[PDB]
Symmetry: C2
Subunit: 132 residues, 2 copies
């Protein structure tokens, strides 16, 4: 009986890896979305002090994760009927007013796909994107 974590959250209502539906809507032109589940990839302090959250769009199916920007998630844990794909290229930043409700939750191993795929997708690879 030692609370390393509490019965609700750390303090942050938005937890990293806790999936929120978001009204990703009035997306411009070729931006993909509408009200869909999104993945919270964001830092810790953004939840605390910023009104803005960075998220990545979830897609049911689209194309096999053959590209380092597409990552797939197990229907089994992620609670869909189908294995879903996260598009690390099709991301955005949405303020807390856009986030509706906690739906789903990611695994630590997919955290690593997510964080990491993201840097390939966004070219910030810590080894330099010109060095592969």
């Amino acid at each position: 009986g030692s609370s390393h974590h509490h019965h609700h959250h750390s303090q942050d209502p938005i937890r990293r890896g806790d999936v929120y539906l978001a009204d990703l809507s009035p997306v411009q032109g070729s931006e993909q979305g509408g009200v869909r589940p999104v993945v919270i990839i964001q830092n810790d302090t953004g939840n605390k002090y910023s009104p803005t959250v960075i998220v990545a769009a979830i897609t049911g199916r689209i194309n096999k994760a053959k590209i380092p920007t597409h990552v797939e998630i197990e229907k089994k844990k992620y609670k869909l009927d189908k294995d879903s794909v996260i598009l690390l290229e099709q991301i955005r930043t949405l303020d807390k007013k856009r986030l509706k409700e906690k739906l789903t939750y990611l695994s630590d191993d997919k955290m690593k796909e997510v964080d990491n795929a993201l840097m390939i997708s966004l070219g910030l690879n810590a080894v330099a994107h010109q060095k592969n």
Copy 2:
């Protein structure tokens, strides 16, 4: 004479670090923007095959870069009359139809602020965001 680079671009019309104005507009709720210059933080292949581009919003002045999510840029090179701030928390993804025109250009040092600030801001730190 040995063209390691050509007289225009590599092939990509959008170069990483080449600043485009963007119609960042119909931003939702508390999203910050309108038509403004944005920073191309994106990878290399997104320019080639994806219609989408990831960018971060440029702001004139707002608050001193005391937060690892705020980075400042020299008016001198960046071609403004004021030192501008890039907000790595206030970013988004915009398709090539949003990008208007090349304005400005970043330095390699600021590249490193940008790539790096970004992982703090988005919690994907390659050392884990829980390990500082």
